[PDB]
Amino acid sequence: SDCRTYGFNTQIVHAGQQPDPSTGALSTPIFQTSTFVFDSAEQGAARFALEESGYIYTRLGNPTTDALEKKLAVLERGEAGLATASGISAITTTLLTLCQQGDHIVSASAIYGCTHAFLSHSMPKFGINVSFVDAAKPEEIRAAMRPETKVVYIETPANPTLSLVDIETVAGIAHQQGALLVVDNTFMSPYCQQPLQLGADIVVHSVTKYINGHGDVIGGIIVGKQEFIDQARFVGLKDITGGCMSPFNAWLTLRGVKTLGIRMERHCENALKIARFLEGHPSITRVYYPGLSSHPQYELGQRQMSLPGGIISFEIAGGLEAGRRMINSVELCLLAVSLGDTETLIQHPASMTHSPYAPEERLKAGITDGLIRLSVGLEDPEDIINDLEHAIRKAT
Amino acid sequence: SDCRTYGFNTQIVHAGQQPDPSTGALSTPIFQTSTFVFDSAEQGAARFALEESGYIYTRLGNPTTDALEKKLAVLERGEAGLATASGISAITTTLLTLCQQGDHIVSASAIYGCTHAFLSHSMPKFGINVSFVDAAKPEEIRAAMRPETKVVYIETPANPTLSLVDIETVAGIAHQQGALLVVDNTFMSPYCQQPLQLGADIVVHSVTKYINGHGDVIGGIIVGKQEFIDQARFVGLKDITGGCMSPFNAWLTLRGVKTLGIRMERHCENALKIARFLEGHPSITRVYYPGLSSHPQYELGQRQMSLPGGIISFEIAGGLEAGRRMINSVELCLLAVSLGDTETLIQHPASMTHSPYAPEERLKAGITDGLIRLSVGLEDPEDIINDLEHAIRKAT
Amino acid sequence: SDCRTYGFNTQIVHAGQQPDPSTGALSTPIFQTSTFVFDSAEQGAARFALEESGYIYTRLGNPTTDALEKKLAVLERGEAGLATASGISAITTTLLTLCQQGDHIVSASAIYGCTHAFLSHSMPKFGINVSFVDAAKPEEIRAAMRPETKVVYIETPANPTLSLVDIETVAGIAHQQGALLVVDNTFMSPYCQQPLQLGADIVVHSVTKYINGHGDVIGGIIVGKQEFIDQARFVGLKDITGGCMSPFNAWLTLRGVKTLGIRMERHCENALKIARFLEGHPSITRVYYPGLSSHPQYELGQRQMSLPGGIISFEIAGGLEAGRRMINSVELCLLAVSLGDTETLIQHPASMTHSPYAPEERLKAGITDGLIRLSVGLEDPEDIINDLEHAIRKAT
Amino acid sequence: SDCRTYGFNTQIVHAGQQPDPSTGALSTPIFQTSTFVFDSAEQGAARFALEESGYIYTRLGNPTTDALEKKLAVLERGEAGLATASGISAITTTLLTLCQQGDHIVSASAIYGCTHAFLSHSMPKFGINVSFVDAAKPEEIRAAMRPETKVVYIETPANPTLSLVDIETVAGIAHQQGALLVVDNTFMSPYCQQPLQLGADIVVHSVTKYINGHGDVIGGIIVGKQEFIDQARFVGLKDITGGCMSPFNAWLTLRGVKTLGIRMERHCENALKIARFLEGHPSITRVYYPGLSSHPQYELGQRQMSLPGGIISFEIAGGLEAGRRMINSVELCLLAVSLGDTETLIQHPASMTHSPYAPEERLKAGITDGLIRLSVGLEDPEDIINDLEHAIRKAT
Ligand SMILES: *Cc1c(COP(=O)(O)O)cnc(C)c1O
Numbered sequence A, B, C, D: 001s002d003c004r005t006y007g008f009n010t011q012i013v014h015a016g017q018q019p020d021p022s023t024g025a026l027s028t029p030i031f032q033t034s035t036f037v038f039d040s041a042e043q044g045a046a047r048f049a050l051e052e053s054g055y056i057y058t059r060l061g062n063p064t065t066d067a068l069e070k071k072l073a074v075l076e077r078g079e080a081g082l083a084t085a086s087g088i089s090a091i092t093t094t095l096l097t098l099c100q101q102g103d104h105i106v107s108a109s110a111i112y113g114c115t116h117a118f119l120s121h122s123m124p125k126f127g128i129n130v131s132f133v134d135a136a137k138p139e140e141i142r143a144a145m146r147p148e149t150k151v152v153y154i155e156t157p158a159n160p161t162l163s164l165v166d167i168e169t170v171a172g173i174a175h176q177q178g179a180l181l182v183v184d185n186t187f188m189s190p191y192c193q194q195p196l197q198l199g200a201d202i203v204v205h206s207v208t209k210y211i212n213g214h215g216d217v218i219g220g221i222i223v224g225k226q227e228f229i230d231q232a233r234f235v236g237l238k239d240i241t242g243g244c245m246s247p248f249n250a251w252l253t254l255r256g257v258k259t260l261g262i263r264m265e266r267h268c269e270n271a272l273k274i275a276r277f278l279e280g281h282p283s284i285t286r287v288y289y290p291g292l293s294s295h296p297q298y299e300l301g302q303r304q305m306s307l308p309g310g311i312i313s314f315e316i317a318g319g320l321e322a323g324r325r326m327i328n329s330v331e332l333c334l335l336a337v338s339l340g341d342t343e344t345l346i347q348h349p350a351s352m353t354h355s356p357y358a359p360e361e362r363l364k365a366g367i368t369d370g371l372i373r374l375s376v377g378l379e380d381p382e383d384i385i386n387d388l389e390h391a392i393r394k395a396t
């Protein structure tokens, strides 16, 4: 049969995978090899000429990684996938394949910090200019487009305030002006949002977050048309970034993604409960969560996202010192800077990642002094709420 | 004590490593994690401000990978190391950290094919121009230097004819003209050649070859001054290539490198025997091996290399068809395109990697129709010789 | 705090685990080591004398495996855990620690086939006699008890007809007669049944099934009182079976168990839907599933099990040939002999595992000619039902 | 061709292994699976009936582990191999397959401590009696034989004094009296001693030591006739010990064994240098090493062993307190209780493993107060000697 025909949970479990043909092994074997052996000179030449399918060398391609690439292509409804060493490598392999000196990119300003650093500081040194705009306002995207614009780049939801971008509307604007739309879908995973179905051309993820979900893999994935992915593989990865994924990391990500549907359901069920608790707490001034009807783009989120996500941000009364006291008072939530793990993770940017920055520079990343970012895990939500209540009460 | 004080075999085993402090575990633990947890807001801020040692997130740094980086820095007599997703990523993370639009690179022409593709086709699209020269002639390096030249880039020995480059002489030329010298030391490993001791500024390796040695890791390493490595880590890797190494791959490379000294001794003992056998064979027109006194740069090799290496190239009588017949007639040597594995690997480029290319285009990579490339493994050399003799006899 | 105080999902995620003390790594490091190093002669002696905590050698104990042992002890409400190379090793390490020549065991007859082979053929050759009884009838257990009986051994539910054993009632009988009760809890996992809370003394699992859940680990676990577990570790494992678990297998099982709660919820939701579909199908003569009210011990199952499980057996009309045709006609369910994986697995014992046996010998394992065993996975239940309907329709 | 025809180093690299048939991957894939899938009911039945080759379930057999089993069978010149969870499991799976209540074993007294504990305390509780003899005196073996003796069990060399057993002579005695000879060949590895070639029936190893060689695997192997190995697999392992090896551990051992020849050569070259240094040191009363001509069985060792090994024991002047001071004064040698790793390991049993024992009880394991045991690693021997000289000088 064809796995593209089954339901989404069935695809999560099975797409891109099948029992090993020589042994019947059910788990995808870990092809932890660099070298592949040819049966003859002619078989080697046939593979190098693309006249025969098969493998050559793990930087170019590998059976374990191929399974992950095919699975994620199915889940995003794209033609082809390309696994990478990190989410950053997925982003930069994509953009360095597409762009050359003299080209231009229109990017959302509300993007992952290291992506912003790449676009702000590294791209212009290669002659590739970037204009940053508020992508919640599609007119600002249009106004920033130039004859040289090759790419519009967006993230949605966008940390740390969980604002949204209207993918379908932005895709139409980008395409009318001759540009590709690249969407970083890390926050949602394909279980909750499908940018290619809304007109995006390329989707990138850090699999480090929800796709792997177990806090033990750094990796990325790119999904798009075969013609583009082939260039991203044989030029961007092979020559430019060298950012190939280890077969063992691909195997762990295949293993983690098996539970993506059930994990996202529980992350989001837990997060909605915690978000409602925080919205009712008189020591919490604001709660940013797409599942609360007061979210400024709530209706867009309901049309574009099948679930409101596992991430919450909120502001605690009392600013910087209260946020520091609160984060130093949790006993179950763990202080860390990643997200999408099975454990609940918490961070206070103004006292952690952005401490030696001026308050007006911190807002440039949307960071207020009392802002706390919470990645909701798979624990009992009552335990998470009790921990938050205990810490908030102490802090205020 | 200080491991930088012990003998080289002792350093191979011990440098960069020690029993785990919390448990005493002798093997370096596999810190297969993405996330690291802070004990307090203040500890997180201290790490982000570089005011406290410790870890944050595996793309930035990891204890397992740190051990590999420190070991390879000791072995190359460099200050610091940076592990990468691939040898290509080591090369491009280095050059994309050092160079920006308007800069220039002087490169040897006799370099790894994918490095050549990066330099020929990708660098100029970022405004970084490259002049290729015959680096066996240091005067051609000097003549190609421009005010904008930031880097001279060399490999030695250089596949597929095993020609050499005089590292010390080229380093002096590069430095007099204000450029850094980057040496790809993959072929030799630090056990056989130490470019930093001869004046190079930066050494890169594909650990995929001899350093790991077991044919099961794609990876790279960069070694140089702390100031440069810090930029390669926090800009080149973090932002540009995203080419971080998986902790499991670092652990496998640590494990492989434990036997680097004994492996290189056996590879080179075997290769010298096989090279002498081939040089005495009337069906073999030429043998390229630094350990044969007829090698055109033999004396330079004796001063610069402690052993002549594990790689041999040779030309079989009868050109393309004889090379194809020979490679299709081996029974022990394995047909493949990597090198530095414990198994003997063999390839015939004119019928394998470069078949759909014109004979005059193949020479542009030094490839004649009868040229065979042999990576000598750890088998009994008598068995390798018998296999080669059987195949040569059949082919001719 | 104490993790034994949190909710069960919180314990699944966190019990037995914490950030690495020397680095903060969130994932439990893979301590893939044999050797541990002492700081002094005195520290080595202190560990060998049990006068100091810490590690010596991985066969005796290991930090990664210790985390798994502690987690499973928390989840089963037992004092201590011991990980093993396989479920069989958990069973035999337990029984060979407890029993010596002249001792006796009363065992259920409806037990895992290889356990039955150990008890029937291997135990008596060591002078340890075994009486098999129908453990659904607690009076048969009582009647089989002898002065030499050390252990009553049961599984519940019991494959392949999913009959039950009343743990609390059997525990009272065993204890009144001076014997320990050992329960194999593999089928249910601690998420669905807690034998120690009902009076059992020792729980064993094959973690190969639901606890790991990902079809990529063979392993076992024993949970019980510290005094017994210490004997199982330092005599049974150290000396008798040698069945220690690899640190990597323990790490994978820790990783798999993170999703145990959400997996069991989905397995059982899916299984109840499929069981009801099969019970309404006129080509299916019988359906064995604890969640159907027609199950002969339905009310006991509701008191003893929090969910009815992920396993279903059923009889297809037409006996042996229909069962063979049906199993050869599924397109999504995979033909295999394990259970508890994320993929739906199916087997027809009369044509697969028990084909060269007489029909009257097959019933001795409860196997009728039309009996099919289904391990329900995490796919969309509609897809599983459609596959079963297609295959049943073709077969009948 | 047939790998049993190549030289021993070629076999170390290649025996039991070949490129993956479906992909050409050179490294043996890690078949980290529990479940295997059948294409039809008939294929499942054919495998269960042994009428078709192939896999069923990893406890029974696995492609990665099969490669290791076949390689070690080739290296020991035996018919078949069986991998296990530990060296202890190799020993007990063997003996519990061969023996039942009423049987008898004649064992050397100079054996590994946990093997001695199994034979002394556990075997008799299963009705299997054991007589311990000085196996350096073959007449004591003969005199201890009884009508019920099934097995003669020996280790050679034997820790901690490195005494020897004449394998060929003992095999002839055992066979004349109708018993099998089992030899634990862990100390030597097949590179240095081949008991089956000298008449032994079964060889066991802890692969934890030299075969893996990297201090990161606990595991065992059994090698013998196909008829016996089949019983050890399908009864001893399947039913009794459950001591199967994890596929990942088998893959690591395959990887470690690739360098067995070059490692043993260097271990033994280093050990002979260190042994000669110790024999010339006036603070060292005795040196136990088969490569010193003063060894009491030196000539037997030269006939039976191709190299004298990597292990040395020696007595330091001043007894218990000097041994403790010496071991607390090394800076490079690591204090630990395993052997065969790439790092040099050292232990002082009288102050470490046997401290709370009476001096007359310590001699029962051949342990004098000043006895030090050294596992010589791959470091520069000059560095090891300097470390030992520094520590000896301080201690005396
Ligand atoms: C973490 C993250 C990234 C970067 O991925 P890495 O795997 O850390 O390189 C990119 N985008 C988003 C939205 C992320 O959360």
Ligand SMILES: *Cc1c(COP(=O)(O)O)cnc(C)c1O
Binding pocket: A059, A242, B086, B087, B088, B089, B112, B115, B155, B184, B186, B187, B205, B206, B207, B208, B209, B218, B219, B220
């Ligand atoms: C193989 C090789 C490389 C590339 O390294 P990868 O690990 O394949 O990316 C670079 N230089 C040399 C000399 C090589 O042999």
Ligand SMILES: *Cc1c(COP(=O)(O)O)cnc(C)c1O
Binding pocket: C086, C087, C088, C089, C112, C115, C155, C184, C186, C187, C205, C206, C207, C208, C209, C218, C219, C220, D059, D242
């Ligand atoms: C599979 C199973 C076992 C055996 O465990 P292994 O890990 O295969 O050794 C024991 N009991 C039950 C109920 C099982 O399903």
Ligand SMILES: *Cc1c(COP(=O)(O)O)cnc(C)c1O
Binding pocket: C059, C242, D086, D087, D088, D089, D112, D115, D155, D184, D186, D187, D205, D206, D207, D208, D209, D218, D219, D220
């Ligand atoms: C270490 C050893 C063993 C035991 O093997 P494990 O892998 O630790 O179970 C048995 N025999 C000898 C000679 C050993 O050195």
